[PDB]
Short mmCIF file of C-alpha atoms and ligand atoms in Angstrom, two decimals:
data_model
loop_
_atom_site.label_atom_id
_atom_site.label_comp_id
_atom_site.label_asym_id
_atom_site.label_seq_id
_atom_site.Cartn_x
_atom_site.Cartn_y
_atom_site.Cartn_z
CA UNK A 1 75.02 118.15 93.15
CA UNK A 2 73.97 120.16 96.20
CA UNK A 3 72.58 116.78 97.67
CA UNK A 4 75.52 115.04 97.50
CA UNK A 5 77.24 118.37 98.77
CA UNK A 6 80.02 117.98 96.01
CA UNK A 7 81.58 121.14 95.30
CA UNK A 8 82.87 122.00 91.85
CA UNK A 9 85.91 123.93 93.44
CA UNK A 10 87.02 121.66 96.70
CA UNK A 11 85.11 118.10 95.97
CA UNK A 12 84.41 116.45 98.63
CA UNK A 13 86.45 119.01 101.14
CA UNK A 14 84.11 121.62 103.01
CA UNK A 15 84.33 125.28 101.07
CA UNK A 16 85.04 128.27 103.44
CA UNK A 17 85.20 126.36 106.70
CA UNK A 18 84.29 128.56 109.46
CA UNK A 19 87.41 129.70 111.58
CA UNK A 20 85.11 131.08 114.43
CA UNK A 21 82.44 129.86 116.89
CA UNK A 22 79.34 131.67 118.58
CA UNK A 23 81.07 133.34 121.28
CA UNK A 24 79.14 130.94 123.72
CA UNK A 25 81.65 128.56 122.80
CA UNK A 26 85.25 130.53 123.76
CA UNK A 27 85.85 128.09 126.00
CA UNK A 28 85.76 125.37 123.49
CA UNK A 29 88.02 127.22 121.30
CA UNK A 30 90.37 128.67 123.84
CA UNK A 31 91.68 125.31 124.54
CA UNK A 32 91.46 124.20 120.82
CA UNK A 33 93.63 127.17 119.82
CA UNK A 34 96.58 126.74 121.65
CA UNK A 35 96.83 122.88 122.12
CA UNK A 36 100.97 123.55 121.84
CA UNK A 37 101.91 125.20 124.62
CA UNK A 38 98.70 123.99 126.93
CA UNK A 39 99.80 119.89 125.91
CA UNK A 40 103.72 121.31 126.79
CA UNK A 41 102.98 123.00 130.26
CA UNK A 42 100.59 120.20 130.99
CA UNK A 43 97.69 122.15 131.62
CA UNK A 44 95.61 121.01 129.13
CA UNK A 45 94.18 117.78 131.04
CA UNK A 46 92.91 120.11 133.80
CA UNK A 47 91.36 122.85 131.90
CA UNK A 48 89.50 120.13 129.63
CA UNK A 49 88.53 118.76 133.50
CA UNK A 50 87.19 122.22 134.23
CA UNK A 51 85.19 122.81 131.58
CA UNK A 52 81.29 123.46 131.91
CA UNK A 53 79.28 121.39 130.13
CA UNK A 54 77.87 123.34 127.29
CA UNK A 55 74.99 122.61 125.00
CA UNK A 56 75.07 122.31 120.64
CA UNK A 57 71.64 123.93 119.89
CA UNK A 58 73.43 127.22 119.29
CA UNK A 59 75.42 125.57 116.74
CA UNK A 60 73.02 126.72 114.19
CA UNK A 61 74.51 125.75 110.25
CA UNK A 62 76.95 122.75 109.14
CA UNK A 63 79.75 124.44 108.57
CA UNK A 64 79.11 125.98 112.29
CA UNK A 65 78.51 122.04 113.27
CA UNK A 66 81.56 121.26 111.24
CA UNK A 67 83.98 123.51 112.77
CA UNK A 68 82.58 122.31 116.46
CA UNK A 69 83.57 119.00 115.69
CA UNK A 70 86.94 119.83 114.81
CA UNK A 71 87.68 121.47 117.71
CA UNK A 72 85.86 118.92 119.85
CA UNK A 73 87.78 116.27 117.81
CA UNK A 74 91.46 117.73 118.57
CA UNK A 75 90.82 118.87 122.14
CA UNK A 76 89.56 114.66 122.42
CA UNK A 77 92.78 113.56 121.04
CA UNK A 78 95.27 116.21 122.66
CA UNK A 79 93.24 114.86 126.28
CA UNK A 80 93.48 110.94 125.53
CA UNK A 81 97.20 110.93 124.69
CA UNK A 82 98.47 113.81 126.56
CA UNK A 83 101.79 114.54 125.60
CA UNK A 84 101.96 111.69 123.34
CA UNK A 85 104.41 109.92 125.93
CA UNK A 86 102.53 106.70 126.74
CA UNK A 87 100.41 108.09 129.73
CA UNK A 88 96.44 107.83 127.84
CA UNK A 89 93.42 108.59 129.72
CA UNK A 90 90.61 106.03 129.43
CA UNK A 91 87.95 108.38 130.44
CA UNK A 92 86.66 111.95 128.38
CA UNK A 93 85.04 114.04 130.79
CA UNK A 94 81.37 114.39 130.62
CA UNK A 95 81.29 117.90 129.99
CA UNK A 96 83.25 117.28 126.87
CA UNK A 97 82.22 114.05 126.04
CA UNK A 98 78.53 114.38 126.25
CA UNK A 99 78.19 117.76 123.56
CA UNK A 100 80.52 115.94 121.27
CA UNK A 101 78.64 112.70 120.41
CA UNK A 102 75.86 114.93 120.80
CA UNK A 103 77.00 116.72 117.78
CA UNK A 104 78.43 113.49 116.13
CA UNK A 105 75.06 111.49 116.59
CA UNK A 106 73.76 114.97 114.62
CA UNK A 107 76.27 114.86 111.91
CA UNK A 108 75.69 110.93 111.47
CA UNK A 109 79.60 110.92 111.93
CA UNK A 110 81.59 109.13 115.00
CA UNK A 111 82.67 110.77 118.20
CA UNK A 112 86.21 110.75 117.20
CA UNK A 113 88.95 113.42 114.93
CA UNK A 114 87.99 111.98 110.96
CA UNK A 115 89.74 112.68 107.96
CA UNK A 116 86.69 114.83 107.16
CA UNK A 117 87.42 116.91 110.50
CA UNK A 118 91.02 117.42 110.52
CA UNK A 119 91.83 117.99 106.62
CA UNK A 120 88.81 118.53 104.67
CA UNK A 121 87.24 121.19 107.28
CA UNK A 122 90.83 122.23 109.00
CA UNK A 123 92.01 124.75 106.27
CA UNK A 124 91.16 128.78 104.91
CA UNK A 125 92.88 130.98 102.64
CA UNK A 126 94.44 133.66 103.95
CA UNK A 127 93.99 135.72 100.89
CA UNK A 128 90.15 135.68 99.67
CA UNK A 129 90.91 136.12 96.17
CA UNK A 130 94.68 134.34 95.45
CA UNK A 131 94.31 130.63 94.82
CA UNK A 132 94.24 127.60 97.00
CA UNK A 133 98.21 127.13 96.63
CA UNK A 134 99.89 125.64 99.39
CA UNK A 135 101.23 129.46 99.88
CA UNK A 136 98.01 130.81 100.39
CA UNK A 137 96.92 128.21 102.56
CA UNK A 138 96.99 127.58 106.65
CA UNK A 139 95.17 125.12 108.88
CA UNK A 140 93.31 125.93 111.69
CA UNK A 141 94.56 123.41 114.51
CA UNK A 142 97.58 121.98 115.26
CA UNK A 143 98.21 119.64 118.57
CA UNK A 144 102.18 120.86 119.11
CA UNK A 145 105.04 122.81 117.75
CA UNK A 146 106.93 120.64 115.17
CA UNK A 147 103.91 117.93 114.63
CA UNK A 148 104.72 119.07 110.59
CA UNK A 149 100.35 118.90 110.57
CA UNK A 150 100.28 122.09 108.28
CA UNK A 151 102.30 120.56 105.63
CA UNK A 152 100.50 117.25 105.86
CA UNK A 153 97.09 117.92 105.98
CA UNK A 154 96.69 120.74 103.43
CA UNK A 155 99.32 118.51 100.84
CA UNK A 156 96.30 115.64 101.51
CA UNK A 157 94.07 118.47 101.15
CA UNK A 158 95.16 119.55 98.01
CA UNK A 159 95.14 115.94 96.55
CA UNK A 160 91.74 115.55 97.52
CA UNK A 161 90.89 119.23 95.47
CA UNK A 162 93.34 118.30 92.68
CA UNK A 163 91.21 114.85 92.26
CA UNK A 164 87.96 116.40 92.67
CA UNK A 165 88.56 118.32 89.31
CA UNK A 166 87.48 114.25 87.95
CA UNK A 167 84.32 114.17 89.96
CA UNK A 168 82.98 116.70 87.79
CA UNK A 169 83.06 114.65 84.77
CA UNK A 170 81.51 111.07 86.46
CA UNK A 171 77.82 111.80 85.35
CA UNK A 172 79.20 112.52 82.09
CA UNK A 173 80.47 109.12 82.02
CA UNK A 174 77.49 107.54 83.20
CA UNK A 175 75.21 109.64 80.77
CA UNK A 176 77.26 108.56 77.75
CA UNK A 177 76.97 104.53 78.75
CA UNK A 178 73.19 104.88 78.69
CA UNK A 179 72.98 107.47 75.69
CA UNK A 180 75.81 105.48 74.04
CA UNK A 181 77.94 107.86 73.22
CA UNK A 182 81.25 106.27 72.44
CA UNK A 183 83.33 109.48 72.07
CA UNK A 184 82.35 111.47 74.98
CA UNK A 185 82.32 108.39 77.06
CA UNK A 186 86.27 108.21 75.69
CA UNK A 187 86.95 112.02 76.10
CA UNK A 188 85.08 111.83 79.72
CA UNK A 189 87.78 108.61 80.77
CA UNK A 190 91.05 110.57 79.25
CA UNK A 191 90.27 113.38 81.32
CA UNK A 192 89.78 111.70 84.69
CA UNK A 193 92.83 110.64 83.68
CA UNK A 194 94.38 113.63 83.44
CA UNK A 195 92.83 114.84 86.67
CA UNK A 196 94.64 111.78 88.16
CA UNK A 197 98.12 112.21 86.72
CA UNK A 198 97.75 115.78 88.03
CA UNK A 199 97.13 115.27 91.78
CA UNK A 200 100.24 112.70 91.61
CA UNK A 201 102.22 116.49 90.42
CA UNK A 202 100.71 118.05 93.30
CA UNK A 203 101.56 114.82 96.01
CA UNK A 204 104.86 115.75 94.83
CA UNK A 205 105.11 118.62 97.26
CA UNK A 206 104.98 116.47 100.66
CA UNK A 207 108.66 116.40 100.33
CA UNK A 208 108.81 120.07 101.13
CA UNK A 209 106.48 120.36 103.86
CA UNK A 210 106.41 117.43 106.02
CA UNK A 211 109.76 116.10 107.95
CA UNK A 212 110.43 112.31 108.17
CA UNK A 213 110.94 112.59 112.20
CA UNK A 214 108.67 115.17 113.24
CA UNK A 215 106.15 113.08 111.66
CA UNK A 216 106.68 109.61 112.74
CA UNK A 217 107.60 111.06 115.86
CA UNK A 218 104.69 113.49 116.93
CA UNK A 219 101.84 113.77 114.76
CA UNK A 220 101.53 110.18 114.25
CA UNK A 221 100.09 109.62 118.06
CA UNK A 222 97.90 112.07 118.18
CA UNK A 223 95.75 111.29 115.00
CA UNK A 224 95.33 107.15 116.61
CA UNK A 225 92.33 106.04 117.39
CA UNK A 226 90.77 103.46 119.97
CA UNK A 227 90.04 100.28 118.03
CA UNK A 228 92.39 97.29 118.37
CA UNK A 229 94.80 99.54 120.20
CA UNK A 230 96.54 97.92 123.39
CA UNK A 231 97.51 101.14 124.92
CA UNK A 232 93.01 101.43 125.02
CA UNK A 233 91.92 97.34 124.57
CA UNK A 234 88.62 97.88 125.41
CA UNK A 235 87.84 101.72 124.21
CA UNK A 236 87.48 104.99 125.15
CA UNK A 237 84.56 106.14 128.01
CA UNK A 238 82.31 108.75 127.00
CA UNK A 239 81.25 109.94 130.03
CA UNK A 240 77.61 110.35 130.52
CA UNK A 241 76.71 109.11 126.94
CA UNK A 242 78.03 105.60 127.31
CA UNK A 243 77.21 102.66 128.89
CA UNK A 244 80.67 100.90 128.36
CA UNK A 245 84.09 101.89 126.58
CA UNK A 246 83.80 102.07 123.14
CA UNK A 247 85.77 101.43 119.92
CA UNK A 248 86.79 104.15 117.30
CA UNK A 249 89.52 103.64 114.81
CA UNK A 250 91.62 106.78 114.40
CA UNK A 251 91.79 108.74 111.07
CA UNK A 252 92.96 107.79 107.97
CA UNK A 253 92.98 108.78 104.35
CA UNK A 254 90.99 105.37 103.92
CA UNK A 255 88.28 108.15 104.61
CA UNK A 256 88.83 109.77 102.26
CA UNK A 257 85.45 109.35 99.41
CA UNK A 258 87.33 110.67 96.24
CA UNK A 259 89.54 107.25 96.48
CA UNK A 260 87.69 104.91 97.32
CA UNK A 261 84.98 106.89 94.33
CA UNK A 262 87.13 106.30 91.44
CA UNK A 263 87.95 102.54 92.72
CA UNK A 264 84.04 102.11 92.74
CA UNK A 265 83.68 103.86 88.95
CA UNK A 266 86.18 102.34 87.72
CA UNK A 267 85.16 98.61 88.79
CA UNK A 268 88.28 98.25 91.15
CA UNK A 269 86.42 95.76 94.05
CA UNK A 270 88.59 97.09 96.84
CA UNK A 271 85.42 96.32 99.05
CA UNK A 272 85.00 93.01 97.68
CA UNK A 273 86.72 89.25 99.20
CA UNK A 274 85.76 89.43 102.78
CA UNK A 275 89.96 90.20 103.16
CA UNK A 276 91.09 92.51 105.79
CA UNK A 277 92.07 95.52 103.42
CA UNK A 278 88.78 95.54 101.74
CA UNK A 279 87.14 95.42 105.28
CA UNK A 280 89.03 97.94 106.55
CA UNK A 281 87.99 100.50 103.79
CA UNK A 282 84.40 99.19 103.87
CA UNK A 283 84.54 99.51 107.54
CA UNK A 284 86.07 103.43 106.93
CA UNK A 285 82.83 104.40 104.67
CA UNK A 286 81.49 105.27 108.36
CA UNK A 287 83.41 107.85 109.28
CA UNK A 288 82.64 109.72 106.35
CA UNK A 289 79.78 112.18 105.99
CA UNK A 290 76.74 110.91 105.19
CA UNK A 291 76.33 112.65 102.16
CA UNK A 292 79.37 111.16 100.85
CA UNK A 293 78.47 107.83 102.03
CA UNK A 294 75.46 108.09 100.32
CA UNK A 295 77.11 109.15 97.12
CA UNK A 296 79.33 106.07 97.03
CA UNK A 297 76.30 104.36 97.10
CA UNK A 298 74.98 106.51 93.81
CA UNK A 299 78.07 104.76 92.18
CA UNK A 300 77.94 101.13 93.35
CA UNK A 301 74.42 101.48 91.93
CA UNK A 302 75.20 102.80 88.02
CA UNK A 303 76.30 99.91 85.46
CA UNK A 304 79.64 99.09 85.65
CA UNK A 305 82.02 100.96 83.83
CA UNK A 306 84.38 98.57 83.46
CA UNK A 307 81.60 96.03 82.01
CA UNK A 308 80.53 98.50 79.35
CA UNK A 309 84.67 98.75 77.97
CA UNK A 310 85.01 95.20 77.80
CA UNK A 311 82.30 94.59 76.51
CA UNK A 312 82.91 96.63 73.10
CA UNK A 313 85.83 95.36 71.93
CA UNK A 314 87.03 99.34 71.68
CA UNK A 315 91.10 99.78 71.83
CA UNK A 316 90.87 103.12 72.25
CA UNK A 317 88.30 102.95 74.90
CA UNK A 318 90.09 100.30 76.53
CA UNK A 319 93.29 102.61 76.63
CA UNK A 320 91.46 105.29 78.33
CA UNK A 321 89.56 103.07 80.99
CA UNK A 322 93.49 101.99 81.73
CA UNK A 323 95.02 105.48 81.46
CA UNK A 324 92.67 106.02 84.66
CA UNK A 325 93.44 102.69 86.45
CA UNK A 326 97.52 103.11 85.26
CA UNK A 327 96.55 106.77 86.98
CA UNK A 328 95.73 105.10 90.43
CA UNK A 329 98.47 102.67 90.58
CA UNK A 330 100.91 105.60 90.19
CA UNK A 331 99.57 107.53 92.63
CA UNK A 332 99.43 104.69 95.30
CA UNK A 333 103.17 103.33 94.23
CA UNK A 334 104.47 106.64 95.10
CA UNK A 335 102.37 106.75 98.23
CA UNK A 336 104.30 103.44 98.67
CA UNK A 337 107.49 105.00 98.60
CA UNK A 338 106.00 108.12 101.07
CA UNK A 339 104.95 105.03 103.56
CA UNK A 340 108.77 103.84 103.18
CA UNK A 341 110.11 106.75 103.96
CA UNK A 342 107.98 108.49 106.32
CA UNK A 343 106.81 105.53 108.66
CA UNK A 344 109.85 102.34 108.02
CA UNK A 345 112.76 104.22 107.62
CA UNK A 346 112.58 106.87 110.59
CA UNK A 347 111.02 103.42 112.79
CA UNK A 348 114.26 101.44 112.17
CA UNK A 349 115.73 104.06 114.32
CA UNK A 350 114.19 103.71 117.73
CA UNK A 351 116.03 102.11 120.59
CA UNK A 352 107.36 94.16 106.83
CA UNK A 353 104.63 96.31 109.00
CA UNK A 354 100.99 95.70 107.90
CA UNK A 355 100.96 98.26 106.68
CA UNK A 356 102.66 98.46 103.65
CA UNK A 357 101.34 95.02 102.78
CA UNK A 358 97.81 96.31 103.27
CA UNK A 359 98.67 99.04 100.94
CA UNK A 360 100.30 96.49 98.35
CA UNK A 361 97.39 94.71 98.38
CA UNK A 362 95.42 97.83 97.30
CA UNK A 363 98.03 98.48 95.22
CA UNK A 364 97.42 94.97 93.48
CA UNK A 365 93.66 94.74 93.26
CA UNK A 366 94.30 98.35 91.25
CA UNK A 367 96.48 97.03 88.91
CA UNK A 368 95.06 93.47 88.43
CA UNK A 369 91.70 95.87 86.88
CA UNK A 370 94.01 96.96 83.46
CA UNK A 371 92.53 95.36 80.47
CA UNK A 372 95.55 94.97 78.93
CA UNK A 373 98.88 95.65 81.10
C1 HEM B 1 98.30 113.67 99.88
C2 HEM B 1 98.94 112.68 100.49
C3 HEM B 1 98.22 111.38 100.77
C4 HEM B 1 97.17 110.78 100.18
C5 HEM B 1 96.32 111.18 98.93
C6 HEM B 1 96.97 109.55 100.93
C7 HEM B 1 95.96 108.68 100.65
C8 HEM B 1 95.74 107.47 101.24
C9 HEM B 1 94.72 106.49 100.86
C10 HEM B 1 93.67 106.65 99.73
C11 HEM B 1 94.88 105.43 101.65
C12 HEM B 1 94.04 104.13 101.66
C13 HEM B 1 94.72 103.04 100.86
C14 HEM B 1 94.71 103.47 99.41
O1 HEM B 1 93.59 103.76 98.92
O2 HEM B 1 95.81 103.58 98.78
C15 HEM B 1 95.98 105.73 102.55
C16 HEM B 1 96.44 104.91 103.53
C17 HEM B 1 97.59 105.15 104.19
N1 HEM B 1 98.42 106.24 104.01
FE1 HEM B 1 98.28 107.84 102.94
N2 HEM B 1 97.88 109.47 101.98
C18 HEM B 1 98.66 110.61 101.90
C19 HEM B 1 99.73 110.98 102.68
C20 HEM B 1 100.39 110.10 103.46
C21 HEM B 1 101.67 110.22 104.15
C22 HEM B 1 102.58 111.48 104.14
C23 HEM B 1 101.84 109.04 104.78
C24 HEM B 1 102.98 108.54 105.68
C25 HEM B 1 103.90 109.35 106.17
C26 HEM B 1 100.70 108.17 104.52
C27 HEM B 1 100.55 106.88 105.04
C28 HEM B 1 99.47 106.05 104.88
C29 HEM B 1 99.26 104.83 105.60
C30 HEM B 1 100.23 104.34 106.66
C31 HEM B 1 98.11 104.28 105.19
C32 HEM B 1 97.43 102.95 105.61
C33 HEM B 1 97.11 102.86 107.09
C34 HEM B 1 96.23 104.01 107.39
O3 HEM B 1 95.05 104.04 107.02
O4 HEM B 1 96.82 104.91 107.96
N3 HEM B 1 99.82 108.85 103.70
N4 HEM B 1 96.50 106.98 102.28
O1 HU6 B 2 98.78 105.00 110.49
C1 HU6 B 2 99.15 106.28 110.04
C2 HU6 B 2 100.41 106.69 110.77
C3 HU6 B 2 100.97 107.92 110.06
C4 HU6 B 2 100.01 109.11 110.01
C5 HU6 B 2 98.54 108.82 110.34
C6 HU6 B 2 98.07 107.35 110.28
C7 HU6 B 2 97.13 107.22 109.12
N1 HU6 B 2 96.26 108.31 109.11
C8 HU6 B 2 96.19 109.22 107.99
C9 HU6 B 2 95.56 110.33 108.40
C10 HU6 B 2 95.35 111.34 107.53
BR1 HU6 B 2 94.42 112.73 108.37
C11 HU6 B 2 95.73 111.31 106.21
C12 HU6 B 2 96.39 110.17 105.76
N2 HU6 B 2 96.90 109.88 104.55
N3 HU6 B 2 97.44 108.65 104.59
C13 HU6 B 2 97.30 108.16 105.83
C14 HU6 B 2 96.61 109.12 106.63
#
């Protein structure tokens, strides 16, 4: 619904993200807009130093709010990591720091670049009325020439949209349980399905638009975060809004809600054992938006799904329930292969991780919920 904000187009990703800010904010976006050559000359430390302090209450809507945090969010991450070299600062200037956990403490989100900043609100067409294609498609920020972040956050952004096309059918789902309505209950699970075996197609395309080096290399230090990192131990400083340094893990698709939705329908416990990959993704919920936190909460509250198929001794409905969870193991074993060859191979040449066996635990727990194999 609209309290949920779900859209039937983009799912979870923001529609139309604003491009442009109140012009009381150039300053904001002057430095946000050319993070490549101002992170190159090295000017970009000062001129964040510079900056005046400026306040949020002219940031009037969400998507307004949205975009601010963005840009906020990148200018944070171009600042603590510089040129992505090894020299980090350990303090954010006041004048930034203090309007952007202003505006996170508003968006119930933390003080740091999310996955629901830098790909779900970091895209527009550039054509109104062709399609949301990759070809019609550019991001908003970048940190520097060659970080390959156009190809790899509108390819995760089109996953998310290409599995959002199944969000649309999860109250019929639930309705049919409660009504119990065998057949649309089986023609709602073959079509998540389908959505699912889609957005694999679509994952497809990272190949084309994202280069092994450039992205191990480069974009890779600019999206870490500050929580169990040694090159920050303790944390980040936020300058007049913080007592002490704190923690903030970096992004991650682990953010992303239309994953960790259709473990949750599906009965998948990903969150469940107290182990270290199903507290990491608990631990993620957080940096999603709170209307998306919320609405995993909707789902963890509905009967089980998985319950109800057992339960009826139904072949047909058990083969649909697994067409889904076969869905998410192929999607994840070819993100498997992705993780080989965008992260281990291009790291075995520089003068397994953990990682990959977080990822094959996830991997597991999804495929240890078939009925039958
Ligand atoms: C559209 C493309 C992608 C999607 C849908 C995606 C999705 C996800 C999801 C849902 C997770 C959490 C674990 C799980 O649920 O499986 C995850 C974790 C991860 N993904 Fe991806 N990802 C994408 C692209 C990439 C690429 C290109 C790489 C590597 C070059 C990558 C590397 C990782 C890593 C390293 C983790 C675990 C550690 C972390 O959170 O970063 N992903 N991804
Ligand atoms: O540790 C990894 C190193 C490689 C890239 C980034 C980080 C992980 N961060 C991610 C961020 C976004 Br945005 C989308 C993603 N999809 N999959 C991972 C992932």
């Amino acid at each position: 619904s609209k309290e949920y904000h779900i859209d039937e187009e983009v799912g979870f990703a923001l529609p139309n993200p604003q491009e442009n800010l109140p012009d009381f904010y150039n300053d904001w976006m002057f430095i946000a807009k050319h993070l490549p050559d101002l992170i190159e000359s090295g000017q970009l430390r000062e001129r964040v130093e510079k900056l005046n302090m400026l306040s949020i209450d002219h940031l009037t809507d969400h998507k307004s709010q949205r975009l601010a945090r963005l840009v906020l969010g990148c200018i944070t991450m171009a600042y603590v990591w510089g040129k992505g070299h090894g020299d980090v600062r350990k303090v954010l200037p006041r004048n930034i720091a203090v309007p952007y956990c202003q505006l996170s403490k508003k968006l119930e989100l933390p003080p740091i670049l999310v996955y629901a900043d830098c790909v779900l609100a970091n895209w527009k067409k550039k054509d109104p009325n062709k399609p949301l294609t990759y070809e019609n498609m550019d991001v908003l920020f970048s940190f520097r020439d060659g970080d390959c972040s156009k190809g790899f956050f509108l390819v995760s952004l089109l996953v998310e949209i290409a599995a959002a096309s199944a969000i649309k059918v999860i109250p019929t789902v639930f309705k049919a349980m409660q009504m119990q309505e065998r057949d649309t209950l089986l023609k709602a699970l073959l079509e998540i399905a389908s959505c699912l075996e889609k957005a694999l197609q679509v994952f497809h395309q990272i190949h084309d638009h994202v280069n092994p080096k450039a992205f191990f290399s480069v974009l890779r230090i600019y999206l870490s975060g500050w929580k169990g990192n040694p090159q920050l131990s303790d944390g980040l400083v936020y300058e007049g809004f913080w007592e002490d340094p704190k923690e903030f893990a970096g992004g991650s698709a682990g953010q992303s809600s239309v994953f960790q939705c259709f473990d949750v329908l599906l009965g998948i416990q990903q969150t469940a054992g107290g182990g270290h990959a199903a507290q990491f993704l608990q631990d993620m919920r957080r940096y999603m938006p709170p209307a998306h936190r919320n609405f995993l909460c909707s789902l963890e509250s509905n009967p089980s799904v998985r319950e109800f198929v057992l339960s009826k001794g139904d072949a047909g409905l058990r083969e649909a329930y697994d067409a889904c969870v076969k869905a998410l193991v192929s999607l994840r074993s070819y993100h498997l292969q992705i993780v080989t060859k965008y992260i281990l191979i291009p790291a075995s040449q520089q003068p397994g991780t953990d990682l990959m066996n977080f990822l094959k635990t996830v991997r597991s727990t999804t495929e240890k919920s078939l009925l039958k194999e």
